Symmetry: C2
Subunit: 106 residues, 2 copies
C-alpha cells in the first residue's frame, strides 16, 4: 500500500533472508536459480557434492493431503518425507528434514 509499508516489507525480507521478492517485483520487467526454498537449497548442495536427490509422491488422499518421500543417495540412502496441501510443500518439508540431518544438528 503506502510505501512506508512497502519499505518495511522490503527491509523485513532482507533482514530475514537477504533477498526481497517485493523489491524484485518492483524492479521486474517483461522485456529483460539466495535459494529461498529447502528443495532448492538441497538441489544445490547435491549438485556441488554430487549425491542424487529424488522424490516419490503419492496421489492426494481422501482428505486432500499429499505425502511424499525424498531419497538422498548414500549407503544406506537417507530417506525422509513430507506432508501437506500440495506436492511442493511436501517436497520442501522433506528437503528441510534432509538438510537438517546433513547439517549434523547434534
Amino acid at each position: 500500500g503506502s510505501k512506508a509499508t512497502v519499505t518495511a516489507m522490503i527491509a523485513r525480507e532482507l533482514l530475514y533472508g537477504g533477498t526481497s521478492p517485493t523489491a524484485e517485483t518492483i524492479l521486474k520487467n517483461n522485456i529483460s536459480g539466495p535459494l529461498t526454498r529447502p528443495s532448492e537449497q538441497l538441489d544445490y548442495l547435491s549438485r556441488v557434492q554430487g549425491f542424487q536427490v529424488e522424490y516419490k509422491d503419492f496421489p492426494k488422499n481422501n482428505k486432500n493431503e499429499f505425502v511424499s518421500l525424498i531419497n538422498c543417495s548414500s549407503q544406506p540412502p537417507l530417506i525422509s518425507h513430507g506432508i501437506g496441501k500440495d506436492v511442493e510443500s511436501c517436497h520442501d518439508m522433506a528437503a528441510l528434514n534432509i538438510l537438517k540431518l546433513l547439517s549434523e544438528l547434534d
Copy 2:
C-alpha cells in the same frame, strides 16, 4: 576437511541464509551484488525506494576502535551509528540499526 564436514558446512550456510560461500568457493574458477551483509541489504533497499545512504567515519581511536555514523535521507534524516574493530563492521552495525528501524519492529 572431510567432506561429511564440508557437506554439513554447506547445508548449514544454506539453512541459515540461502547461500553457501563454501559451495561458491568449491565451484569458483579464475577464468569465468542474496545480499548477506546489512550494509549491502540497505544499499539495495535505498536503490529501489530511492533514499540516499551515506556513512561518516571517525579515525580509529587510541583503543583501536572505529566509530561511524550512517545517514538515511528523510525529514528529519535517520541517523544511526556503529562501532567496531574495523570500518566495515561499523557500517554493518549502523546499517542493521537502520534496517530494523525501517522494518517497524514495534
